[PDB]
Each structure stands twice: as structure tokens, then as C-alpha cells.
Design a protein around this ligand. Structure first.
Ligand SMILES: N[C@@H](CCC(=O)N[C@@H](CS)C(=O)NCC(=O)O)C(=O)O
Lengths: 223, 241
């Protein structure tokens, strides 16, 4: 009894990557169900779900309208959603119709899913869940996460500079418009204080940037 | 620190073509070269000397903020600059497609592009990073942490199991599709054709021995999969160049 249209999102109550898909889905006006799996009971490893996501992790998204197509990596899901919306509307919302812009959005998106999220996750593990407490390991990742934020900080700082040379405004990573590249960081920005990173104090531009995204109803509507 | 050489480059950039900033010991650097080669895109490679801090060159950091390799400059597109191996592959297959109409190593169907993307993000997010951490604690950390090594080594084997399970399922599909003597026919991750999804793993598959993983014995399907790709000329030329 699978739906004819719409979407179903598998996630976790604590998953920042799961929230990343919820935000995009709501921002694009797509209709969706949300099934939160309970890891403790190994629902993310049960056959029926590995059939959906071979990697057995959330998020995962079933595009009912597309014959129950399963897209499983959070980054792949975003690319699917913005591609789907552009194709249906002709409007590259949170995306771009220009190939050069697309390459940039993807650059920041891969940077986020591959160099920002994993590092924050390793920082969280060694600090709260490792079988042993090792500071060198915790420091390795908190340091790397700070380097990453320094990268986005420097980027936004230059977008700011450019804007100012154009005599209080929001600045974005690509094409001076909100995109999945910017939204990909939101769920994680909101949790790094758990590893001792105070964005407000340490990364001013990132603080503004993230403040602008948290004030969006579509980002609140699902958080 | 001396990057005068890198600064000179950004003063005189070719009309068109591609310049690739890589490093001889960077698997993702070669992932790009492979695809670049498979698509017939002519490119020159500059191996950044991190020891000399060339990656700190203002002209390089401008083109690529994360100051890490690989990074590709598309001189034909006003010297556009893509800085993530995953974003570089997508740019290449897309550019190739609109220029020829033949989605080589790609797909023209949205559903297939999504499946390819899944495996691509997976390799860049769950594959490469975990192998990186495994190598780090095994050989480069300031101290020895056995548990940290076991953790990432366990994860690298887990992610390989996923690819193995996936390739095994594709195998059975093709077997019970005309039948066995078809136990060594080439199998691919999506659409029964080689795509950037399969190619993304090869440079790294050759590195996992350093962390004690033996693909040929522990992951048979992954082994056949790697060998088929390894015998392609474009591949050989890339890993060799
Ligand atoms: N690269 C993946 C990461 C997926 C991921 O880390 N999922 C977590 C959510 S916190 C999960 O399922 N954790 C359960 C587990 O590790 O057992 C993506 O962005 O989709």
C-alpha cells in the first residue's frame, strides 16, 4: 500500500543529515511522510530497509511518484530534489540553471557531506561515545572542524566584501542566492556547540549566515 | 615556503583545456585524472608541493578555498575552478554530455543519475574519509590508539561489504537473465554500464592493503570489478601519467 505520489523520508530524531532533507523538501513545497527509525532496535539494519539503503543508514528517500525510487545519500537526495523541482517548474530554486554555478554548489555540497559532517561526527564519537577517553583524538577532529568553518568563514567574508563594495544583507556561498550548498550546513551548525565550538564568537560571518537560515519558516517548520 | 611557480601559472592560463592540481600520493587526485582520461579531455597536471607550501599560494587558495587537492581548472569556461573530486566528476560528465549528447560514464535518465549520485556521495563521504582515518591512526597519529585503528578498519570493511553485497546482487540478476559461465562477466553499480560511480573507487581500492584489507580474498566481486576497470587504457594512462 505504497503512495501514488509524494515522498517518504526515513530519518532519525537526532540525525542532522535527516533534517537536511526535511528542510529542502519543505522549502521546495514537496509533500512527505517521515518515518523515524529506532537504531537501538536495529530498524536501520532490517532487510526491508537495507533494500532501500544498502548502506543501512538514514536519510533515505522514496520518490513514490517515480515508481518508489530510492535515493539514499543525503547529498544525492538534495541533488535529486532540486533537479526534480527545476525540471517540473523551470525555476532553479535553491539550485541554478547555469552549469558553472552548479559545479560550485556541488563543490560546497561535497565539501559539506565529505569534509564537514564526517569530521563533526568523529569529534562527537571520541568525546561522548568512544570506549576510552583520548584527547589527542578529540582535538584532531575539533581542530579539523574549526579549519572547515574557517574555510566557509573566509568565503562568506569575501562575499560580504563584494556586497559592501556595492554601497545589513544576507550573503551566500554561490551565485548570491540561497542554495542547497548553504542549507547543507544548517543542521550541523546548530550542533557544534556540543563539541565546544561557539560559532557566534568564533565565526561572525558564519553566525550571520546561519542566523539567516534558522529564521526561515521552512527550516523551522521541520526542526 | 615558495610558490612562485604556482603564482606564475595563474598569471598565464591557457585559452582552453584543463589544468589539474594533484599530488602523487592522493587517490582522489587520480580519481579525477581517470575520469578526465576516460572522457578524452586533454589536461596537464601540476603536483603541488605541500612541503614548499604551494597549497598556501594566494592564487591557489582563491581558486580553491579548502587549499586541498584535487582541484580542476576549466580554462574554456573562463578558467572556472572546481575543488571537490565528487564535484569535479559531475562537472565532467555533464560537460561531456551537453557537448556530445552521449552520457558517457553518466546517464541521461534522472533515476540513474540519482543512483550514480548515491554511490558517488557514499564513496566520498563514507569510503574515502574512513580509509583516511584508518591510515591516520595506523601510521600518522601522535600516539598509538588501537581502538581508533580497529574502529575505522572495521568501518572500511563494512563499507566494502556494502559494495560487495550490491555487486553480488547485480551478479545474480544477470546470471538469472540467461542461464554458470557468466560468473565473471563485467558487472556495474548502475545501469549495467561503467559510470563515474564505479570509477570513483578504483584509486582507493588499491590503497586498502596498507590497512590490512585483502580485496581478492575478502571481497571477490569487488576484486573482479576492480580488475576490469584496471585493464582499460584510459585508466592505465591516468594512474601511470
Ligand atoms: N553520508 C551519509 C551519512 C549518513 C549517516 O551518518 N546517518 C546516520 C544518522 S546520525 C545513521 O544512520 N546512524 C546510525 C548508525 O550509524 O548506526 C549521508 O549524508 O546521507
Amino acid at each position: 500500500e505504497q503512495p501514488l505520489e509524494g515522498y517518504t523520508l526515513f530519518s532519525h530524531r537526532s540525525a542532522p543529515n535527516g533534517f537536511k532533507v526535511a528542510i529542502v523538501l519543505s522549502e521546495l513545497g514537496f509533500h512527505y511522510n517521515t518515518i523515524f527509525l529506532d537504531f537501538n532496535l536495529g530498524e536501520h539494519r532490517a532487510p526491508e530497509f537495507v533494500s532501500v539503503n544498502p548502506n543501512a543508514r538514514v536519510p533515505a528517500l522514496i520518490d513514490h511518484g517515480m515508481d518508489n525510487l530510492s535515493i539514499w545519500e543525503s547529498g544525492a537526495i538534495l541533488l535529486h530534489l532540486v533537479n526534480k523541482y527545476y525540471k517540473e517548474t523551470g525555476n532553479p530554486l535553491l539550485w541554478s540553471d547555469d552549469l558553472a554555478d552548479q559545479s560550485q554548489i556541488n563543490a560546497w555540497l561535497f565539501f559539506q557531506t565529505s569534509g564537514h559532517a564526517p569530521m563533526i561526527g568523529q569529534a562527537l564519537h571520541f568525546r561522548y561515545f568512544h570506549s576510552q577517553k583520548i584527547a589527542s583524538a578529540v582535538e584532531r577532529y575539533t581542530d579539523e572542524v574549526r579549519r572547515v568553518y574557517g574555510v566557509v568563514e573566509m568565503a562568506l567574508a569575501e562575499r560580504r566584501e563584494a556586497l559592501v563594495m556595492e554601497l545589513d544583507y544576507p550573503v551566500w556561498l554561490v551565485g548570491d542566492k540561497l542554495t542547497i550548498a548553504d542549507l547543507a550546513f544548517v543542521p550541523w551548525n546548530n550542533v557544534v556547540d556540543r563539541i565546544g565550538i561557539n560559532i557566534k564568537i568564533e565565526f561572525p560571518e558564519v553566525y550571520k549566515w546561519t542566523k539567516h537560515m534558522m529564521r526561515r519558516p521552512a527550516v523551522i517548520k521541520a526542526l
